[PDB]
Amino acid sequence: KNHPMLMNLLK
Amino acid sequence: KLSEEQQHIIAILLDAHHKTYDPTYADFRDFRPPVRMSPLSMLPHLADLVSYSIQKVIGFAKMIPGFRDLTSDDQIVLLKSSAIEVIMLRSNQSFTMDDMSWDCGSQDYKYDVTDVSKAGHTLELIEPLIKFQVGLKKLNLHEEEHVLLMAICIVSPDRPGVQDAKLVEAIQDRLSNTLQTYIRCRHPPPGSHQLYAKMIQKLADLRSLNEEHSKQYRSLSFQPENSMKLTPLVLEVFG
Ligand SMILES: C=C1[C@H](O)CC(=C/C=C2\CCC[C@]3(C)[C@@H]([C@H](C)[C@H](CCCC)CCC(C)(C)O)CC[C@@H]23)C[C@H]1O
């Protein structure tokens, strides 16, 4: 599924 | 015998670790408090600790040379798959072979086998985790080796869902070559090969602990009562 929080922590 | 490139890798990883691991554990005061009376009284606290640790691991990863040059999806699969292992690994710094617990600056934030039990984990997993911590501690790793090992752990080309395995292997190989050389600079043969071999066996053990857990966190979080006690990032990461 989507990982919006992990994505955001990566940027 | 460390080249400049190797030394630069180590330096970057030392900084990243120092930036993402506060040996005062001051932030722990902001977690849900621990309770040691109450099924799973330690779950809120340890869930917050795990969640916080995931944030910090992500911070460490982003500084690993080349990591952020991977695709976003590869970075996610790598972090989702390694988070628990790196947590376990990084936790060795608080771990003490005195009473076999993780000591984070006080009795309130000092975690033992029964504390972990009260977070919904069976002794049957918990014990192999303690054993791992013991074995690792006995290596008496230099901080240089410790951070390299964390980085090697994260950038593994054999994690499920990885698309560019070759690129991930390119980073890992540089890290492994750096670790091997660092070891050689401290230890002649065959002590050097001995220590390296043991570090590699620790990464294998972590994979095993990871696999075993996944089955357990599946049964714990499957319960809606428990999953509700976790955090959003823990739910996102551990599926
Ligand atoms: C900031 C720090 C580290 O990130 C982590 C740390 C201590 C680590 C601990 C003690 C409490 C129990 C933890 C969080 C363990 C945890 C509860 C897991 C289960 C959660 C998985 C998502 C162990 C899994 C087993 C092996 C029981 O199945 C692993 C690391 C353990 C304190 C400090 O060194």
Side-chain angles (χ1 to χ4, degrees), chain A residues 2-11, chain B residues 1-67 69-224 226-239:
Chain A
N2 276 116
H3 303 75
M5 291 174 277
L6 218 179
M7 257 280 44
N8 176 73
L9 294 166
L10 281 170
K11 80 172 273 157
Chain B
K1 330 195 150 282
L2 287 164
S3 63
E4 276 289 317
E5 186 187 351
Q6 288 175 333
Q7 294 187 63
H8 181 271
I9 289 175
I10 292 171
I12 289 173
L13 296 186
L14 293 173
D15 176 72
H17 181 57
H18 296 163
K19 279 174 174 45
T20 54
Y21 194 101
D22 165 16
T24 74
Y25 311 100
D27 288 320
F28 283 36
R29 306 279 212 194
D30 302 287
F31 301 164
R32 295 170 281 178
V35 180
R36 307 165 159 88
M37 306 258 196
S38 64
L40 284 48
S41 54
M42 282 302 277
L43 180 55
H45 187 72
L46 289 185
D48 288 339
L49 203 205
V50 166
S51 188
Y52 175 87
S53 292
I54 290 173
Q55 299 190 42
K56 291 304 181 190
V57 170
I58 293 158
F60 177 74
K62 293 202 302 192
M63 288 187 269
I64 290 179
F67 183 86
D69 295 333
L70 291 173
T71 72
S72 179
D73 284 310
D74 277 0
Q75 303 181 212
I76 291 158
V77 304
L78 287 179
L79 290 166
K80 291 183 75 288
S81 165
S82 70
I84 187 57
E85 299 174 29
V86 185
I87 288 166
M88 286 180 178
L89 255 166
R90 83 206 294 290
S91 82
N92 200 248
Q93 189 161 160
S94 68
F95 191 72
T96 179
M97 290 190 290
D98 278 330
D99 41 336
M100 313 288 181
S101 70
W102 294 264
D103 187 346
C104 299
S106 57
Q107 225 78 206
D108 262 2
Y109 311 138
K110 184 160 219 254
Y111 312 108
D112 83 305
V113 178
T114 84
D115 285 344
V116 182
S117 198
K118 297 168 191 176
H121 313 265
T122 69
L123 281 71
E124 294 201 82
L125 324 172
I126 298 175
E127 188 255 55
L129 172 60
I130 301 294
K131 166 170 177 54
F132 171 79
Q133 290 304 320
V134 179
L136 183 63
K137 207 75 178 193
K138 293 169 171 183
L139 296 183
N140 191 203
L141 296 189
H142 292 70
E143 193 168 47
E144 290 82 345
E145 286 147 347
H146 179 66
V147 301
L148 285 157
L149 196 63
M150 288 184 293
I152 296 170
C153 178
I154 294 171
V155 173
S156 304
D158 66 319
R159 306 278 192 181
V162 175
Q163 296 260 245
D164 290 314
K166 288 164 160 280
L167 264 14
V168 171
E169 185 172 70
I171 301 158
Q172 193 190 60
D173 282 348
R174 293 188 291 273
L175 300 163
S176 299
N177 177 212
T178 297
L179 177 49
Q180 288 163 17
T181 304
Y182 179 89
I183 293 168
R184 261 192 295 270
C185 291
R186 308 229 84 247
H187 293 301
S192 42
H193 310 321
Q194 303 191 157
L195 165 62
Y196 189 55
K198 294 193 221 225
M199 286 179 93
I200 299 314
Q201 180 56 232
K202 287 285 175 286
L203 293 178
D205 305 336
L206 278 169
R207 288 300 178 106
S208 171
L209 289 158
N210 186 348
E211 156 108 356
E212 248 48 62
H213 176 239
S214 297
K215 311 177 182 211
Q216 198 138 142
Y217 170 95
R218 273 208 254 297
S219 288
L220 182 100
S221 93
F222 166 95
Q223 230 265 259
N226 295 326
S227 201
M228 232 176 49
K229 304 317 269 217
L230 301 181
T231 73
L233 182 57
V234 181
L235 295 166
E236 201 189 266
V237 159
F238 306 144

Short mmCIF file of all heavy atoms in Angstrom, two decimals, chain B residues 116-162:
data_model
loop_
_atom_site.label_atom_id
_atom_site.label_comp_id
_atom_site.label_asym_id
_atom_site.label_seq_id
_atom_site.Cartn_x
_atom_site.Cartn_y
_atom_site.Cartn_z
N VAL B 116 9.24 -6.29 28.09
CA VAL B 116 8.98 -6.57 26.70
C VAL B 116 7.74 -7.49 26.61
O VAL B 116 6.89 -7.42 25.67
CB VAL B 116 10.26 -7.18 26.01
CG1 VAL B 116 10.05 -7.46 24.51
CG2 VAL B 116 11.45 -6.23 26.11
N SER B 117 7.61 -8.34 27.61
CA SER B 117 6.49 -9.32 27.71
C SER B 117 5.16 -8.54 27.80
O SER B 117 4.21 -8.74 27.08
CB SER B 117 6.72 -10.25 28.93
OG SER B 117 5.91 -11.39 28.79
N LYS B 118 5.19 -7.52 28.61
CA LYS B 118 4.06 -6.69 28.81
C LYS B 118 3.86 -5.73 27.61
O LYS B 118 3.06 -4.81 27.70
CB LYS B 118 4.26 -5.92 30.13
CG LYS B 118 4.31 -6.86 31.35
CD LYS B 118 4.78 -6.12 32.59
CE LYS B 118 5.09 -7.09 33.74
NZ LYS B 118 5.67 -6.45 34.97
N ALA B 119 4.57 -5.95 26.50
CA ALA B 119 4.25 -5.29 25.24
C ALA B 119 3.71 -6.25 24.25
O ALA B 119 3.59 -5.91 23.07
CB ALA B 119 5.47 -4.57 24.65
N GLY B 120 3.39 -7.46 24.70
CA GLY B 120 2.70 -8.42 23.86
C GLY B 120 3.60 -9.37 23.10
O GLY B 120 3.18 -9.94 22.08
N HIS B 121 4.85 -9.54 23.57
CA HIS B 121 5.76 -10.53 22.98
C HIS B 121 6.16 -11.72 23.85
O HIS B 121 6.55 -11.65 25.07
CB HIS B 121 7.02 -9.88 22.39
CG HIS B 121 6.74 -8.68 21.53
ND1 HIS B 121 6.63 -8.75 20.15
CD2 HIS B 121 6.58 -7.39 21.87
CE1 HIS B 121 6.39 -7.53 19.68
NE2 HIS B 121 6.34 -6.69 20.70
N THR B 122 6.16 -12.85 23.20
CA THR B 122 6.37 -14.07 23.98
C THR B 122 7.84 -14.19 24.30
O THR B 122 8.69 -13.75 23.54
CB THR B 122 5.93 -15.32 23.23
OG1 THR B 122 6.82 -15.54 22.11
CG2 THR B 122 4.48 -15.13 22.77
N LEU B 123 8.12 -14.86 25.42
CA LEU B 123 9.51 -15.09 25.88
C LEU B 123 10.30 -15.86 24.85
O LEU B 123 11.53 -15.80 24.78
CB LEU B 123 9.49 -15.82 27.22
CG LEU B 123 9.21 -14.92 28.40
CD1 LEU B 123 7.76 -14.46 28.40
CD2 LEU B 123 9.53 -15.61 29.71
N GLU B 124 9.57 -16.57 24.01
CA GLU B 124 10.17 -17.46 23.04
C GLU B 124 10.88 -16.72 21.95
O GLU B 124 11.79 -17.26 21.37
CB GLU B 124 9.09 -18.35 22.44
CG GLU B 124 8.50 -19.30 23.49
CD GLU B 124 7.85 -20.49 22.85
OE1 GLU B 124 8.61 -21.43 22.53
OE2 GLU B 124 6.61 -20.50 22.69
N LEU B 125 10.31 -15.65 21.40
CA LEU B 125 11.07 -14.57 20.74
C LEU B 125 12.02 -13.70 21.59
O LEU B 125 13.14 -13.42 21.17
CB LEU B 125 10.11 -13.66 19.96
CG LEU B 125 8.92 -14.34 19.28
CD1 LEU B 125 7.95 -13.31 18.72
CD2 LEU B 125 9.41 -15.28 18.18
N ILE B 126 11.58 -13.28 22.78
CA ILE B 126 12.31 -12.27 23.55
C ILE B 126 13.69 -12.82 23.89
O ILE B 126 14.72 -12.09 23.81
CB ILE B 126 11.60 -11.82 24.81
CG1 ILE B 126 10.29 -11.16 24.44
CG2 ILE B 126 12.51 -10.83 25.58
CD1 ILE B 126 9.44 -10.77 25.60
N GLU B 127 13.72 -14.12 24.28
CA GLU B 127 14.99 -14.75 24.67
C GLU B 127 16.04 -14.74 23.54
O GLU B 127 17.19 -14.45 23.78
CB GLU B 127 14.78 -16.18 25.19
CG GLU B 127 16.06 -16.79 25.78
CD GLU B 127 16.73 -17.83 24.88
OE1 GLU B 127 17.06 -17.57 23.70
OE2 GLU B 127 16.95 -18.95 25.37
N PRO B 128 15.69 -15.14 22.32
CA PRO B 128 16.71 -15.04 21.22
C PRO B 128 17.21 -13.58 20.96
O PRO B 128 18.35 -13.37 20.54
CB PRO B 128 15.98 -15.61 20.01
CG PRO B 128 14.92 -16.50 20.58
CD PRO B 128 14.49 -15.87 21.88
N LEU B 129 16.41 -12.60 21.31
CA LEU B 129 16.77 -11.21 21.17
C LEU B 129 17.82 -10.81 22.22
O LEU B 129 18.83 -10.17 21.92
CB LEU B 129 15.54 -10.28 21.20
CG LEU B 129 15.95 -8.78 21.24
CD1 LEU B 129 16.78 -8.43 20.00
CD2 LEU B 129 14.78 -7.86 21.49
N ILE B 130 17.62 -11.28 23.44
CA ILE B 130 18.58 -11.07 24.51
C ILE B 130 19.88 -11.74 24.21
O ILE B 130 20.94 -11.10 24.35
CB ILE B 130 18.09 -11.67 25.83
CG1 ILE B 130 16.77 -11.03 26.18
CG2 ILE B 130 19.12 -11.46 26.95
CD1 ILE B 130 16.83 -9.57 26.50
N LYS B 131 19.80 -13.00 23.78
CA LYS B 131 21.01 -13.74 23.38
C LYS B 131 21.85 -12.99 22.29
O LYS B 131 23.09 -12.99 22.29
CB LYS B 131 20.62 -15.14 22.89
CG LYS B 131 21.71 -15.92 22.13
CD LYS B 131 21.28 -17.39 21.90
CE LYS B 131 22.31 -18.17 21.07
NZ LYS B 131 23.66 -18.10 21.67
N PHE B 132 21.12 -12.47 21.29
CA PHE B 132 21.71 -11.70 20.23
C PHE B 132 22.43 -10.50 20.79
O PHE B 132 23.52 -10.23 20.40
CB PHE B 132 20.62 -11.21 19.28
CG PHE B 132 21.13 -10.22 18.26
CD1 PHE B 132 21.80 -10.69 17.17
CD2 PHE B 132 20.95 -8.88 18.43
CE1 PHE B 132 22.28 -9.83 16.20
CE2 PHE B 132 21.43 -8.00 17.51
CZ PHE B 132 22.09 -8.47 16.37
N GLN B 133 21.76 -9.75 21.65
CA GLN B 133 22.35 -8.60 22.29
C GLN B 133 23.66 -8.94 23.03
O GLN B 133 24.66 -8.22 22.92
CB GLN B 133 21.41 -8.05 23.26
CG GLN B 133 20.21 -7.40 22.63
CD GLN B 133 20.53 -6.29 21.63
OE1 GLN B 133 21.44 -5.45 21.83
NE2 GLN B 133 19.72 -6.25 20.56
N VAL B 134 23.65 -10.09 23.71
CA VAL B 134 24.83 -10.60 24.45
C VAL B 134 25.96 -10.88 23.53
O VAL B 134 27.03 -10.36 23.73
CB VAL B 134 24.50 -11.89 25.28
CG1 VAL B 134 25.71 -12.43 26.03
CG2 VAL B 134 23.49 -11.56 26.32
N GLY B 135 25.71 -11.69 22.51
CA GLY B 135 26.71 -12.02 21.50
C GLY B 135 27.34 -10.81 20.81
O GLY B 135 28.56 -10.72 20.55
N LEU B 136 26.50 -9.83 20.55
CA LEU B 136 26.95 -8.61 19.88
C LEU B 136 27.82 -7.80 20.84
O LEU B 136 28.91 -7.35 20.48
CB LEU B 136 25.73 -7.82 19.41
CG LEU B 136 26.04 -6.55 18.62
CD1 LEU B 136 26.75 -6.92 17.34
CD2 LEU B 136 24.70 -5.90 18.38
N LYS B 137 27.39 -7.69 22.08
CA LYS B 137 28.14 -6.93 23.04
C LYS B 137 29.54 -7.49 23.20
O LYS B 137 30.49 -6.73 23.24
CB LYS B 137 27.45 -6.92 24.41
CG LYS B 137 27.75 -5.71 25.29
CD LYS B 137 26.99 -4.46 24.79
CE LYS B 137 27.23 -3.31 25.69
NZ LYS B 137 26.33 -2.14 25.48
N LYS B 138 29.63 -8.83 23.27
CA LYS B 138 30.87 -9.51 23.39
C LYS B 138 31.83 -9.20 22.24
O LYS B 138 33.06 -9.30 22.40
CB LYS B 138 30.66 -11.03 23.58
CG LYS B 138 29.99 -11.34 24.94
CD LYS B 138 29.50 -12.78 25.07
CE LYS B 138 29.05 -13.08 26.53
NZ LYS B 138 28.62 -14.48 26.81
N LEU B 139 31.31 -8.78 21.08
CA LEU B 139 32.23 -8.36 20.00
C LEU B 139 33.05 -7.11 20.34
O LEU B 139 34.07 -6.87 19.73
CB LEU B 139 31.52 -8.21 18.65
CG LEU B 139 30.91 -9.50 18.08
CD1 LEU B 139 30.28 -9.24 16.71
CD2 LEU B 139 31.96 -10.60 17.98
N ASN B 140 32.60 -6.35 21.32
CA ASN B 140 33.20 -5.09 21.74
C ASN B 140 33.51 -4.17 20.53
O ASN B 140 34.63 -3.63 20.41
CB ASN B 140 34.44 -5.39 22.57
CG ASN B 140 35.01 -4.15 23.30
OD1 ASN B 140 36.17 -4.14 23.62
ND2 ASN B 140 34.21 -3.12 23.54
N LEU B 141 32.54 -4.06 19.62
CA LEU B 141 32.68 -3.29 18.36
C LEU B 141 33.08 -1.85 18.57
O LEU B 141 32.66 -1.21 19.50
CB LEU B 141 31.42 -3.33 17.52
CG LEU B 141 31.00 -4.68 16.99
CD1 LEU B 141 29.88 -4.47 16.00
CD2 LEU B 141 32.15 -5.45 16.34
N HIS B 142 33.95 -1.36 17.73
CA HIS B 142 34.21 0.06 17.70
C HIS B 142 32.98 0.73 17.09
O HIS B 142 32.30 0.15 16.30
CB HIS B 142 35.44 0.40 16.82
CG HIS B 142 36.73 -0.07 17.41
ND1 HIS B 142 37.07 -1.41 17.49
CD2 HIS B 142 37.74 0.61 17.96
CE1 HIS B 142 38.24 -1.52 18.09
NE2 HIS B 142 38.67 -0.31 18.38
N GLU B 143 32.74 1.97 17.45
CA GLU B 143 31.63 2.74 16.86
C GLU B 143 31.69 2.74 15.34
O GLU B 143 30.64 2.67 14.71
CB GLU B 143 31.55 4.17 17.42
CG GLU B 143 30.23 4.78 17.02
CD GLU B 143 29.88 6.07 17.74
OE1 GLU B 143 30.73 6.97 17.83
OE2 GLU B 143 28.76 6.17 18.20
N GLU B 144 32.90 2.74 14.76
CA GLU B 144 33.08 2.71 13.31
C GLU B 144 32.47 1.42 12.73
O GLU B 144 31.85 1.44 11.68
CB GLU B 144 34.57 2.77 12.87
CG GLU B 144 35.25 4.13 13.10
CD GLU B 144 35.74 4.33 14.55
OE1 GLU B 144 35.33 3.58 15.49
OE2 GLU B 144 36.55 5.23 14.73
N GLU B 145 32.64 0.30 13.43
CA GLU B 145 32.21 -0.94 12.94
C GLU B 145 30.72 -1.01 13.11
O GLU B 145 30.05 -1.56 12.22
CB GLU B 145 32.85 -2.12 13.68
CG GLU B 145 34.32 -2.32 13.31
CD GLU B 145 35.21 -2.85 14.45
OE1 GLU B 145 34.78 -2.83 15.65
OE2 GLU B 145 36.33 -3.35 14.07
N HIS B 146 30.24 -0.47 14.22
CA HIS B 146 28.82 -0.47 14.58
C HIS B 146 27.99 0.25 13.53
O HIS B 146 26.96 -0.27 13.03
CB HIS B 146 28.64 0.14 15.96
CG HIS B 146 27.21 0.23 16.45
ND1 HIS B 146 26.44 -0.88 16.72
CD2 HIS B 146 26.44 1.30 16.76
CE1 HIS B 146 25.25 -0.51 17.16
NE2 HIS B 146 25.22 0.81 17.20
N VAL B 147 28.44 1.44 13.16
CA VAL B 147 27.67 2.19 12.13
C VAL B 147 27.76 1.60 10.75
O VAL B 147 26.83 1.66 10.01
CB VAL B 147 28.08 3.68 12.14
CG1 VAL B 147 27.78 4.19 13.57
CG2 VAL B 147 29.55 3.83 11.70
N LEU B 148 28.92 1.04 10.39
CA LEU B 148 29.03 0.32 9.13
C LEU B 148 28.07 -0.84 9.06
O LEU B 148 27.51 -1.12 8.04
CB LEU B 148 30.44 -0.14 8.81
CG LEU B 148 31.38 0.93 8.36
CD1 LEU B 148 32.82 0.56 8.59
CD2 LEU B 148 31.14 1.30 6.89
N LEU B 149 27.89 -1.51 10.18
CA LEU B 149 27.09 -2.76 10.22
C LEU B 149 25.60 -2.35 10.06
O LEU B 149 24.85 -3.00 9.37
CB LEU B 149 27.35 -3.49 11.52
CG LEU B 149 26.89 -4.96 11.50
CD1 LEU B 149 27.67 -5.73 10.45
CD2 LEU B 149 27.04 -5.55 12.88
N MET B 150 25.21 -1.25 10.69
CA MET B 150 23.88 -0.78 10.55
C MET B 150 23.61 -0.46 9.10
O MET B 150 22.58 -0.80 8.56
CB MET B 150 23.55 0.38 11.47
CG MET B 150 23.40 -0.05 12.98
SD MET B 150 22.89 1.36 13.98
CE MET B 150 24.38 2.37 13.85
N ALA B 151 24.60 0.15 8.45
CA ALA B 151 24.42 0.64 7.08
C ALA B 151 24.35 -0.62 6.14
O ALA B 151 23.56 -0.69 5.24
CB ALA B 151 25.59 1.56 6.74
N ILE B 152 25.25 -1.58 6.34
CA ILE B 152 25.24 -2.82 5.58
C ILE B 152 23.90 -3.46 5.73
O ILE B 152 23.29 -3.96 4.72
CB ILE B 152 26.40 -3.78 6.03
CG1 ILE B 152 27.73 -3.08 5.69
CG2 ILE B 152 26.33 -5.12 5.29
CD1 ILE B 152 28.96 -3.71 6.25
N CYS B 153 23.36 -3.43 6.95
CA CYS B 153 22.05 -4.04 7.20
C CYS B 153 20.95 -3.40 6.38
O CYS B 153 20.25 -4.09 5.65
CB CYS B 153 21.72 -4.02 8.69
SG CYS B 153 20.17 -4.65 9.21
N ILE B 154 20.92 -2.05 6.35
CA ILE B 154 19.90 -1.39 5.62
C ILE B 154 20.01 -1.65 4.09
O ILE B 154 19.01 -1.92 3.43
CB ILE B 154 20.03 0.10 5.94
CG1 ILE B 154 19.68 0.34 7.42
CG2 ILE B 154 19.27 1.01 4.94
CD1 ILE B 154 19.99 1.75 7.90
N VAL B 155 21.22 -1.57 3.53
CA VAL B 155 21.37 -1.60 2.10
C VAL B 155 21.71 -3.03 1.65
O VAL B 155 22.84 -3.32 1.13
CB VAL B 155 22.41 -0.59 1.64
CG1 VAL B 155 22.69 -0.73 0.18
CG2 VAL B 155 21.86 0.83 1.89
N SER B 156 20.75 -3.92 1.89
CA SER B 156 20.88 -5.24 1.49
C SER B 156 20.09 -5.46 0.18
O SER B 156 18.86 -5.14 0.18
CB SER B 156 20.38 -6.19 2.59
OG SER B 156 21.07 -5.93 3.78
N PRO B 157 20.76 -6.01 -0.85
CA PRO B 157 20.15 -6.23 -2.17
C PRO B 157 19.14 -7.41 -2.16
O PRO B 157 18.32 -7.50 -3.00
CB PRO B 157 21.33 -6.44 -3.11
CG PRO B 157 22.44 -6.99 -2.26
CD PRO B 157 22.19 -6.42 -0.84
N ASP B 158 19.16 -8.22 -1.10
CA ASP B 158 18.30 -9.34 -1.03
C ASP B 158 17.04 -9.13 -0.22
O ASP B 158 16.50 -10.04 0.29
CB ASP B 158 19.09 -10.55 -0.53
CG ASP B 158 19.57 -10.41 0.88
OD1 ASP B 158 20.02 -9.32 1.30
OD2 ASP B 158 19.49 -11.42 1.57
N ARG B 159 16.56 -7.91 -0.13
CA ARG B 159 15.32 -7.65 0.59
C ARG B 159 14.16 -7.77 -0.36
O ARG B 159 14.25 -7.33 -1.48
CB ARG B 159 15.32 -6.27 1.21
CG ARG B 159 16.52 -5.98 2.10
CD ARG B 159 16.27 -6.53 3.41
NE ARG B 159 17.23 -6.05 4.43
CZ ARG B 159 17.19 -6.45 5.70
NH1 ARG B 159 16.25 -7.28 6.06
NH2 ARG B 159 18.11 -6.08 6.58
N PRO B 160 13.06 -8.40 0.06
CA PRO B 160 11.88 -8.58 -0.83
C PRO B 160 11.39 -7.23 -1.40
O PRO B 160 11.40 -6.23 -0.67
CB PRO B 160 10.85 -9.24 0.10
CG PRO B 160 11.31 -8.92 1.48
CD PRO B 160 12.78 -8.79 1.46
N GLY B 161 11.13 -7.16 -2.70
CA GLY B 161 10.55 -6.00 -3.28
C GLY B 161 11.56 -5.02 -3.85
O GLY B 161 11.17 -4.07 -4.52
N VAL B 162 12.85 -5.30 -3.69
CA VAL B 162 13.89 -4.44 -4.24
C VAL B 162 13.91 -4.52 -5.77
O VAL B 162 13.86 -5.57 -6.30
CB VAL B 162 15.26 -4.75 -3.64
CG1 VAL B 162 16.32 -3.93 -4.33
CG2 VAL B 162 15.26 -4.44 -2.15
#
